[PDB]
C-alpha cells in the first residue's frame, strides 16, 4: 500500500546515513534493501527503530508515506465525498442509497451516515428511513458499550447535530469524564462534543447541563499530554461567559463574551465570527 521504504531511503539520504546505519542490528543488508525497495512489508516495531535511527518523527514518516489523507481506504473517500455532496445536493440520492444500507457496518460508516443525514436536514430532503431507525440504531450501537474511542465522540458530535438533545444526552453522560489522551485526533473529537453540547445547552437554556459541559472541558486541561484546541478554548470560554451572564446576570460577562467574539473577527476566523454573532443575537431572545 504505502511506500514507507522509499520515504526511509529518502530521509536516510537527506541526512547522509548509510544503509548500514539503519539495518545494523535489526536485519540483514539484503533484507533491509528489500525494505527500502518497498518489496518487504515492514513491521511497526522495525519502523519505530529506523525512526529513532534517523532522528525523524515516527508519525511524521508515516504521514510522509501516505497515511495522511483519508484516501488511504474506502471509509476515507466516503468521508471526503460528504463535503462534496454538501455543496452539490443533487449528488445525495445516488450515494445515500449505498451508504444508508451499511450505516451499521463500522463506527466509521455510521458517522458518514449521520453525515448524509446532516445534509438532508439542511436542504430539507426526505429521510423517512432515518426517523424510523436512529433510536434503534443507537440502542444497538451503544447499549452495551463501556469504553469509547475517537470515532464514538465524532459520532456523538454529528448525533447532536441531527437529533434533539434529549435523545442524545443519555449516550453522552457515560463518555465523560476523560481520563487519558490518545492522540491529537482523539483530543480533538472529545473537545468538539463538549463545544457542541455546551452550545446546545446554552441555546436551550439548560444551565445545569451547560454547567456540566463547562466542567468537563475544564477537567480536560488537567490531563497529561492533552492538546487543548485554542479556537475551541476561545469559543467554549465565550459560552462560559454567556452562561455566567445568564445566571449571575453580570454585565462584565456579557462584555467579555463580546470581546471574544470580536477577537475571532480580528484574527480572521470569519466563519466562527458570523456564527457567534448570530448566536449571540439569538441568545438575547430565544
Amino acid at each position: 500500500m504505502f511506500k514507507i521504504g522509499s520515504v526511509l531511503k529518502q530521509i536516510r539520504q537527506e541526512l547522509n546515513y548509510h544503509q548500514i546505519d539503519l539495518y545494523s542490528g535489526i536485519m540483514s543488508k539484503s533484507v533491509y534493501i528489500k525494505v527500502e525497495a518497498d518489496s518487504r512489508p515492514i513491521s511497526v516495531e522495525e519502523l519505530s527503530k529506523f525512526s529513532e535511527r534517523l532522528g525523524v518523527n515516527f508519525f511524521e514518516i508515516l504521514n510522509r508515506a501516505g497515511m495522511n489523507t483519508k484516501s488511504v481506504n474506502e471509509t476515507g473517500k466516503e468521508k471526503l465525498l460528504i463535503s462534496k455532496i454538501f455543496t452539490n445536493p443533487d449528488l445525495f440520492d445516488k450515494n445515500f442509497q449505498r451508504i444508508e444500507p451499511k450505516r451499521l457496518t463500522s463506527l466509521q460508516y455510521f458517522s458518514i451516515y449521520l453525515g448524509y443525514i446532516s445534509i438532508a436536514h439542511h436542504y430539507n430532503i426526505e429521510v423517512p428511513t432515518f426517523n424510523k431507525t436512529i433510536t434503534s440504531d443507537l440502542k444497538h450501537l451503544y447499549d452495551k458499550r463501556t469504553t469509547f474511542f475517537g470515532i464514538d465522540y465524532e459520532i456523538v458530535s454529528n448525533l447532536l447535530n441531527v437529533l434533539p438533545y434529549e435523545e442524545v444526552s443519555s449516550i453522552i453522560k457515560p463518555m465523560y469524564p476523560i481520563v487519558d489522551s490518545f492522540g491529537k485526533d482523539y483530543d480533538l473529537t472529545i473537545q468538539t462534543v463538549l463545544k457542541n453540547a455546551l452550545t446546545i445547552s446554552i441555546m436551550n437554556r439548560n444551565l445545569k447541563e451547560a454547567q456540566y459541559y463547562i466542567n468537563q472541558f475544564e477537567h480536560l486541561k488537567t490531563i497529561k499530554n492533552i492538546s487543548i484546541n485554542g479556537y475551541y478554548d476561545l469559543e467554549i470560554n465565550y459560552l462560559k461567559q454567556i452562561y455566567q451572564f445568564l445566571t449571575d446576570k453580570n454585565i462584565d460577562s456579557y462584555l467579555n463574551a463580546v470581546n471574544i467574539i470580536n477577537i475571532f473577527k480580528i484574527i480572521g476566523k470569519e466563519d466562527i465570527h458570523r456564527s457567534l454573532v448570530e448566536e449571540l443575537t439569538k441568545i438575547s431572545a430565544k
Partner: peptide, 7 residues
Amino acid sequence: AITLIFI
C-alpha cells in the same frame, strides 16, 4: 456553534 466532525 454546533460543529460537524469527520476524521
